């Protein structure tokens, strides 16, 4: 299974996207972070061209537990970079599962030519197996 | 927040502002606006137990604040952070001394004052500020 970390010139920090920054968002007050319910937000809240129909339930102040990769919007349209140049799920409709599952076409853009699909490999598989197996001589010989 | 010494009243201007009595049950009550009950709305027939949970949490932040974090600096200390004295413009306390003022009695000795006493309180004291570095122009005020 070959995959590319989903970097995207369209994703931004959750907090950069919030319109009304509240104490609960910024403060990072523990008392709150441990007793609030999950938060429903949409891809629109994470990518500029994010689909608002894709809703996700994240854990409070999770944006304070991890930072996202960054790609200057300039690479956004240069063919040849394996970045997601379009918010995930942009062409699958308001459907979460379809956004989460990797859409291989999302990468067609950056390859000179898939004469051998997108990836390919060759290897030697050395397998040794002990087992009860009469010799070929025994099989072909009757008596 | 008086703007000029002239906005101060007779007593204040001449003797200084009044301060709090030493702390005791009746002079150190919880701030007058202390919550005695926290209400939480509920749909006509059900209650969101998850909300109730948050409700408490929220309350907790409110209480902590009312009880002891009313000053910005103290809230920040709450997080395990700190603030310079420039942050909220607080005067910097350089030295604090405290002591009891005792003295003696003077015995009355004439026909009518014999067996009477007058208390003369007279206490000696030292108040010493260790070498302090003044980073910017200003004043070093010492009050009693």
UniProtKB/Swiss-Prot annotation, chain B:
Species in which this protein is naturally found: Escherichia phage alpha3 (Bacteriophage alpha-3)
Function: Assembles to form an icosahedral capsid with a T=1 symmetry, about 30 nm in diameter, and consisting of 60 capsid proteins F. Upon virus binding to host cell, one of the spikes dissociates from the capsid and the virus interacts with LPS through the exposed EF loops on the F proteins. After the genome had been ejected, the channel formed by the F proteins at the unique fivefold axis remains open.
Localization (cell): Virion
Residue ranges the record marks as coiled coil: none
Family: Belongs to the microviridae F protein family.
Protein known as: Capsid protein F
Binding partners and assembly: Pentamerizes and interacts with H protein, G and B pentamers to form 12S pre-assembly complex. By binding with protein D, induces joining of twelve 12S complex to form the procapsid. The procapsid has an external scaffold made of 240 copies of protein D, 60 copies of the internally located B protein, and contains 60 copies of each of the viral structural proteins F and G. Upon genome packaging, interacts with protein J. The mature virion is composed of 60 copies each of the F, G, and J proteins, and 12 copies of the H protein.
